[PDB]
Paper text:
In siphophage T5, the unique RBP is located at the extremity of a central fiber. FhuA, an outer membrane E. coli iron-ferrichrome transporter, is the bacterial receptor recognized by T5 (25). We present the structures of T5 tail tip, determined by cryo–electron microscopy before and after interaction with its E. coli receptor, FhuA, reconstituted into nanodisc. These structures bring out the important conformational changes undergone by T5 tail tip upon infection, which include bending of T5 central fiber on the side of the tail tip, tail anchoring to the membrane, tail tube opening, and formation of a transmembrane channel.
The structures of the tip before and after interaction with FhuA start to diverge from BHPpb3 distal domains. More precisely, hdI and hIV overlay remarkably, with an RMSD of 0.85 Å over 244 residues. However, hdII and hdIII rotate around the long helix of hdIII as a rigid body (the RMSD before and after opening of hdII-III is 0.75 Å over 367 residues), and the plug unwinds in a long β-hairpin. These conformational changes result in BHPpb3 trimer opening, creating a channel with a constant ~40 Å in diameter from the hdI-hdIV ring to the hdII insertion tip. The three β-hairpin legs connect BHPpb3 to the nanodisc: Their tip is composed of 233-Leu-Phe-Gly-Leu-236, which would insert into the outer leaflet of the lipid bilayer hydrophobic core. In the crevice opened at the interface between two BHPpb3 subunits, extra densities were identified, in which the 43 C-terminal residues of TMPpb2* could be modeled. These densities merge with the ill-defined densities of BHPpb3 β-hairpin, strongly suggesting that TMPpb2* continues toward the nanodisc along BHPpb3 β-hairpin, forming with the latter a three-stranded β sheet. TMPpb2* is in turn expelled from the tail tube and anchor its C terminus in the crevice created between BHPpb3 monomers upon opening. Its hydrophobic segments would then insert in the outer membrane to form a transmembrane channel. Thus, T5 tail tube is anchored to the outer membrane by both BHPpb3 and TMPpb2*, in addition to FhuA-RBPpb5: It ensures that the tail tube is locked in register with the channel formed by TMPpb2* in the outer membrane.
Numbering used by the authors:
A (entry chain c): 1 to 720
B (entry chain h), D (entry chain i): 1085 to 1127
C (entry chain d): 529 to 720
The structure:
């Protein structure tokens, strides 16, 4: 619920005649975008001056009703304009297409007896925001009938605040996009499209999207001259052919490097992701040494846990696996990360920024540099030093000097890893690399006010908050559009200790997001998320919310992230406050569910889906053995027990359900979805029965339509 | 030396009505032991 | 074109027409084949000539497109299919990076450049779109679909605005229902 | 004698906003050259 100033409640209760006015601020298309001109309108009979902005009266005939529910979707609002006005008819007809995706902000204003605006909203002491979004259509209907009165109505179609979530906002490895170069028209030209002002000088993604497929010829200092280690059986006889030593000899290498431009992902936990090779090359003289730089995740990253060289990780999963191939330490119970190689027999810990790991194994040796993402990190020192000596073949072939890998190639906000392979007769090619990375560092807002962003977090609420407050790879929503206290309380709700299992039952603790093998980490929900930025941010937010069954709503300009949960202070509504219309409907027969298929990637085995089915035997017996599966997203969950508890909780919650829909006067303005309602109605036998708001619709008249939901006893996450 | 006799395939159906157990993790990851998904002894 | 005669002749004709975005209509016993082309001599219709009722609607939001997938067969690769994707970067930037692909029949096309030009032309043409519909008396009998119309209406800024017919309906009373279609500027195959 | 190192796959996305060029044909058919789909030198 959105609390309103106390004076607002007093005025609403006391006064029976409210002179509501809707203030519309519309954005006109125009050149000089910084000079963005706005046209203000209102349906009040007189012009309303609000914060130095004069909202002209007229031209607004009607406004539709804003509607929202617990499932994320792009709400739509349509308002009409008088078609007899010349300005509006010309604008719609000859510019109605240029108006697309232009902002509109409708405010609901109650006018005092003196013509002033009653300060309803406590955040600004102003009106209560009614709508905000971007136009998405037009339409005019000039209906002319002979012998009568004609009609000319202009209709504007709009989408609510969530239309801003259709954007796909993900860093793209291409150099032109990352550095903000203008869309090339012939020659290239720098522009101001960079996400950050410091990106323009970051040439890190140079050589990103190119396909160098050539029959290169290399000069190898071997097998042409000088002493050769071959002694004949006879004491005096010797091998006069001189080779096996440094001297040039021609050699044709048919290299084929296809570095494409793929969208970089975002990881919010211990997840396994592939590499996106951004730079490839081989030494000038020895083709057997190849440098390939892979891009993993974004932002400051807690570090790498392990590297997968062609499906064979550097650390063996169990005791059994170690016999099949060479390994170093276990993951089952000791759960050590890759950082044991540099510090043998150490504790479990992620990798180190700018530290090299020499993974010595059969078939050859591998050198790996782990460069964690950072807002300001220097260039790869090894690559710069090699470039200064012109050691890269493709550098000399293309003629590039010491700028081939210059100090200015500081990959910013990207956790890339440099892998140097030593091609031999055993490792005859470069195998696709994948790694187990800890998630991005995420801010956790304590209630007192202090924050901490020194580690990644498994909490769904805080992961969503981080994804929704980053402009460079998420939705550009400022922190000042979020109620901190409510978000923090919800995050606590998703951190309730779950007692259905012990911490010793899950052996692969380190690789399910648990940073300690002893401390309490039985959170009720734990999401190890991979946010593939290729998809729309809308889909990413929906996928995150589907993990813990939350819901995001934006009514009155505040972004509410809420979860179906019990409350000890529900809003009390009596039937006599209702408009008297009532409708109780039963949906248990349709929504009865007794099984769920869980396809979850289990780190114990090389990350791969396990088709696991959770079913409740009692429910099936009640269902007469009939199978009823509810589609439940397990993509973001790697802990088996959290997945099981989530499945059982949803199955239980899907056993009792009714829909109750009625209406309520404007006195109860600000009923957000997923709000606790205590509906008392003595005729039915209801005394403060607990409901949850499923659907709330706001009408310009003040009638607030509702669709409440009824749940079984103690089925919520809060208490049992 | 070593001989193996194989038959059938593990059943991944889990009954969430009964309380959780480590036997489920052992059985669902292909560990060697005696029992079903709802009651597994991992040796 | 390979015309697999096993399929119905209706399907084959539709497949051929979809290649160049043409249209075949049979009104008044003439098999007229036509394509969306610019015309310098449209039929002039005024609002007063039209019946009273008018209706202008916008469909640009729904029909904005910025990418297309082209499974064109390449003779160079032993006549195997290439999954080639054509996208307009500027449109995607104007679309907030969202992908909007239009199902385009690239069969019976083997010249890559013709396919690319067709894709770019369709993407350009699918950026501006309105549906204007009204009713005209029996005097204007014979208005075939996909015909050039010069609609003039003083109340708007329209003076012989160029439209294209999209749906003509003939009744027994003579009242003819029309549904025109507005397009961008110089977006037609015939235009410069 | 002859050794080949491979990595990745050619990207078939083409930006039709830019003017046509033979580099696109060279890239899309797997010709041996240096450059992207929007700018390819076929050698």
């Amino acid at each position: 619920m959105k609390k309103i100033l106390d004076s607002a409640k007093n005025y609403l209760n006391t006064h029976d005649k409210l002179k509501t006015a809707c203030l519309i601020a519309l954005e006109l298309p125009s050149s000089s975008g910084s000079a963005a001109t706005y046209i203000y309108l209102t349906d009040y009979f007189r012009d309303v001056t609000y914060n130095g902005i004069l909202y002209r009266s007229g031209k607004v005939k009607s406004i539709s009703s804003h509607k929202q529910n617990r499932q994320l979707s792009i709400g739509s609002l349509s308002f009409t304009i008088t078609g007899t006005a010349e300005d509006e008819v010309l604008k719609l007809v000859q510019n109605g297409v240029s108006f697309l995706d232009r902002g509109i902000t409708i405010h609901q204003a109650i006018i005092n007896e003196e013509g002033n605006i009653l300060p309803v909203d406590p955040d600004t002491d102003g009106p209560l925001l009614f709508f905000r979004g971007r136009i998405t259509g037009g339409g005019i209907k000039d209906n002319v009938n002979t012998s009568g009165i004609g009609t000319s109505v202009i209709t504007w179609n709009c989408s609510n605040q969530f239309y801003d979530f259709d954007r796909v906002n993900g860093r793209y490895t291409d150099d032109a996009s990352h550095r903000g170069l203008e869309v090339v028209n012939g020659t290239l030209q720098p522009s101001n499209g960079a996400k950050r002002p410091e990106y323009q000088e970051d040439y890190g993604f140079f050589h990103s999207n190119k396909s160098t497929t050539i029959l290169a010829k290399y000069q190898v200092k071997e097998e042409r001259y000088k002493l050769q280690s071959k002694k004949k059986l006879f004491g005096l006889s010797r091998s006069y052919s001189l080779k096996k030593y440094y001297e040039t000899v021609t050699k044709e290498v048919d290299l084929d490097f296809n570095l494409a431009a793929k969208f970089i992902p975002v990881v919010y936990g211990v997840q396994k992701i592939p590499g996106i090779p951004i730079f490839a090359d081989t030494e000038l003289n020895n083709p057997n040494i190849v440098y390939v730089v892979y891009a993993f995740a974004e932002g400051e990253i807690d570090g790498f846990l392990d590297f997968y060289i062609g499906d064979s990780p550097m650390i063996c999963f169990d005791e059994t696996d170690s016999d099949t191939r060479t390994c170093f330490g276990r993951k089952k119970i000791v759960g050590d990360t890759m950082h044991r190689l540099a510090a043998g027999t150490s504790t479990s810990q992620p990798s180190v920024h700018g530290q090299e790991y020499k993974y010595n194994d059969g078939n050859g040796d591998i050198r790996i540099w782990t460069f964690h993402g950072k807002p300001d990190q220097t260039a790869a020192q090894v690559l710069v030093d090699i470039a200064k000596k012109k050691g890269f073949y493709l550098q000399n072939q293309n003629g590039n000097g010491p700028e081939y890998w210059d100090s200015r190639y500081k990959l910013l906000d990207t956790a890339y890893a440099i892998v140097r392979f030593t091609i031999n007769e055993n490792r005859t090619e470069i195998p696709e690399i994948s790694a187990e990375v800890q998630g991005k560092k995420v801010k956790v807002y304590n209630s007192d006010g202090t924050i901490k962003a020194d580690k990644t977090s498994l909490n769904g609420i805080w992961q969503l908050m981080d994804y929704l407050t980053s402009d460079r790879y998420g939705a550009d929503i400022t922190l000042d559009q979020f109620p901190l206290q409510k978000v923090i309380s919800e995050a606590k709700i998703l951190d309730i200790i779950d007692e259905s299992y012990q911490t010793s039952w899950q052996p692969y603790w380190r690789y399910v997001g648990w940073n300690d093998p002893l401390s309490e980490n039985r959170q009720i929900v734990q999401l190890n998320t991979i946010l593939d930025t290729s998809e729309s941010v809308f889909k990413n937010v929906q996928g995150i919310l589907e993990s813990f069954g939350g819901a995001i709503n934006n009514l009155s300009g505040e972004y509410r992230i809420t979860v179906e949960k019990y409350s000890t202070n529900p809003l009390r509504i009596n039937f006599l406050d209702t408009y008297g219309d009532l409708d109780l409907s039963d949906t248990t027969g349709r929504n009865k569910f007794n099984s769920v298929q869980a396809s979850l990637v289990d780190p114990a085995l090389s990350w791969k889906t396990n088709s696991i089915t959770f079913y409740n035997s009692k429910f099936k017996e009640q269902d007469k053995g009939l199978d009823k599966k509810l589609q439940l997203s397990f993509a973001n969950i790697t802990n088996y027990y959290t997945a099981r508890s989530y499945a059982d909780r949803e199955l239980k919650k899907s056993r009792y359900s009714r829909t109750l829909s009625f209406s309520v006067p404007y006195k109860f303005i600000g009923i957000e979805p997923n709000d606790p309602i205590a509906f008392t109605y003595e005729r039915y036998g209801w005394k403060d029965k607990f409901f949850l708001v499923d659907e709330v619709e706001n009408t310009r008249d003040g009638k607030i339509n509702l669709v409440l939901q009824e749940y079984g006893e103690d089925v919520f996450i809060n208490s049992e | 030396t070593t001989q193996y006799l194989t038959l059938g395939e593990r059943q991944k159906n889990v009954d969430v009505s009964m309380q959780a157990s480590s036997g489920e993790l052992s059985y669902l990851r292909g560990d060697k032991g005696i029992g079903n998904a709802n009651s597994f002894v991992p040796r």
